Design a protein around this ligand. Structure first.
Ligand SMILES: N[C@@H](CC(=O)O)C(=O)O
Ligand SMILES: N[C@@H](CC(=O)O)C(=O)O
Lengths: 294, 294
């Protein structure tokens, strides 16, 4: 779409809903004693997004700052762990992510710029975080019924499936989404170095929306031990050089066990509004593979 | 400071205060019927930050996005105006800004990454917005007295200085800040093309903190007429191509009269904690001229 066409759309309703969602979600966390952090957009280090069955192996956008290469935020995962290392205990941030994925990921829920409500909790287990998210989502859906007068899924807790079993039964997370009528969990997904792996089991979780809307949240317990972290990085063919300051902190023994998740705000807006494509709820669309004109 | 030293700092109280500040300010705006938008970090267009007394003519950092040159957000001013054009009426956003200024700007209040609470109001006039910001600050300061047990500036309304009168009496905005015990306004400052100028008078305003803490907020009424906008860009030596899609919307006569401002969140946290350098309230410092290690 061209500039004038974009500004001509009627997205008042979507933005009204977005406002209510942000109000609800931020209060949910501050009510429970979480600290509210501001995002970082440039850093020597960022989320590799690899290995990850959900990705194609993209490289972060990079810009020089005073002669030094910085990466644009893929996600603040590493910085969340660092915030826990600073003793903040329970944190969240409204974090813009930049992920320059290909046209092949333009499936209606992807956007090359998007904001996650990203949170982390010192000492938490996967069960704790999944339960917290269920509490948030159930509460959100009840409020949405009041806001819209429409019905939303009423489940207070969601069924749990192993990634391996999803592949066997449905073939893909996307096909699973199409068949379900309530949100559900996919757990135990082999992916990035920071997700906690124990004896072949990955302590992680993705929340998937029903009716084909796809993944809305992703998280896990974390690795915190230097030796384990470095082995995982090397095994994936990644470079220690790409994580130098983070690995210095890990080597010093300053990472702590924690668990967390990120929640796609615009993906939730899309679900509540019932929009076919996420672009319909964004003032300034950022469609994968298509450089925005504004 | 190496990475280990950075995360070994104490920042708990500062983040505690920041959390209370963000809760307060976001509610202030949502209570008044403002829509809560999400930020954009990459665009073909951004705030030129020039001409501007407080700038130094820095050019936006750029990155390739699917073969197209995109600018990292200096400020969302142009995008705020486009949101008004879309009929959103009253909007705000927690917008990260990237401004790669020189070491000369490392004065205790500047950071090369920072977040503004940026807001815009269709049809608003400068007196309206200044009164709104005064209302916000007065309320925040009364709350801060409860949070901290210390005393803050009392005034319900701040003294207004014309820019040229600040230059005459104090020499600069910094010197003025150091000699005041109450927040004050500086108005009528010649700067960027988007600020409204009528008969040699600029309808804009900066809020300055006392005790040398310096500027905390800046805004104004906007130009919306194509001919007026084009003339100011051309006279400034700026290239029209740099603002193409924005100018298309102006030409189509879709821009509307509006006024707004941005409020520096970290600068407020600094003022309330009483920190000498703004780095002290940031988990991940972004000091002008010093590329961050994390
Ligand atoms: N935010 C997610 C990672 C992601 O960005 O997908 C997490 O906490 O693990
Ligand atoms: N946010 C300001 C511009 C700035 O100081 O970045 C405005 O509303 O005009």
């Amino acid at each position: 779409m061209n500039a004038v066409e974009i500004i001509s759309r009627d997205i008042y309703k979507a933005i009204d809903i977005q406002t209510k969602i942000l109000d609800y979600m931020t209060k949910f966390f501050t009510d429970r004693g979480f600290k509210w952090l501001l995002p970082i957009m440039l850093s020597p280090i960022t989320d590799p997004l690899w290995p990850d069955p959900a990705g194609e192996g993209i490289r972060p956008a990079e810009v020089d700052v005073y002669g030094v290469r910085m990466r644009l935020t893929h996600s603040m995962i590493l910085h969340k762990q660092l915030a826990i290392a600073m003793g903040l205990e329970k944190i969240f941030v409204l974090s813009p992510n930049i992920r320059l994925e290909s046209r092949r990921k333009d499936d209606g829920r992807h956007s090359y710029e998007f904001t996650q409500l990203d949170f982390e909790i010192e000492g938490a287990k996967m069960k704790d975080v999944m339960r917290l998210i269920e509490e948030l989502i159930y509460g959100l859906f009840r409020k949405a019924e009041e806001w819209t007068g429409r019905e939303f899924p009423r489940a207070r807790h969601f069924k749990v499936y192993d990634y391996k079993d999803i592949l066997e039964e449905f073939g893909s997370d996307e096909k699973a989404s199409m068949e379900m009528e309530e949100p559900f969990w996919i757990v135990n997904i082999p992916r990035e170095f920071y997700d906690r792996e124990e004896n072949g089991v990955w302590k992680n979780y993705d929340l998937i929306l029903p009716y084909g809307y796809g993944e809305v949240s992703s998280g896990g317990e974390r690795e915190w031990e230097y030796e384990k972290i470095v082995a995982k990085i090397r095994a994936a063919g990644l470079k220690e050089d790409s994580f130098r300051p983070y690995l210095e902190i890990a080597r010093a023994g300053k990472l702590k066990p924690s668990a967390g998740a990120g929640i796609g705000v615009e993906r939730l807006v899309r679900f509540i509004v019932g929009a076919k494509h996420i672009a319909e709820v964004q003032p300034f669309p950022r469609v994968p593979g298509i450089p925005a004109v504004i």
